[PDB]
Amino acid sequence: GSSGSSGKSLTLVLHRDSGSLGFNIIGGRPSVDNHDGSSSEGIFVSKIVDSGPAAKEGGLQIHDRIIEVNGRDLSRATHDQAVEAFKTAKEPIVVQVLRRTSGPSSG
């Protein structure tokens, strides 16, 4: 068989309190430099509104890489897309993040 590789994937349901998922994302730079070094973009959480439905029931976690949102892949998407995704996203919004092992270091 073949299923998995590293890290773990969790699901989180996000909602919209009012044009505010209740958090912020980072990544996606408007620079398409020739392929050589750092390439591809990523969507991560740098902020999270407590009072927001993202921190409330959302389940999100500051410094978390979004894998999918409402079924929309944003792993290689940009803030623009991510934003739009979460914007055009409907509740409940099924989001997935990639979190390392449950217990990092220290057996």
Curated annotation (Swiss-Prot):
Residues 11-101 form the PDZ domain. Auto-ubiquitinated. It is found in: Synapse; Cytoplasm. Widely expressed, including in the heart, skeletal muscle and liver and, at lower levels, in the brain, colon, small intestine, placenta and lung. Down-regulated in ovarian serous papillary tumors. Interacts with NLGN1 and EFNB2. Interacts with UBE2D2 and with MUSK via the first PDZ domain. The RING-type zinc finger domain is required for E3 ligase activity. E3 ubiquitin-protein ligase. Plays an important role in regulating the surface level of MUSK on myotubes. Mediates the ubiquitination of MUSK, promoting its endocytosis and lysosomal degradation. Might contribute to terminal myogenic differentiation. This is E3 ubiquitin-protein ligase PDZRN3. The lineage of its organism: Eukaryota, Metazoa, Chordata, Craniata, Vertebrata. The gene is PDZRN3. The chain holds residues 246 to 339 of 1066 of the full protein.
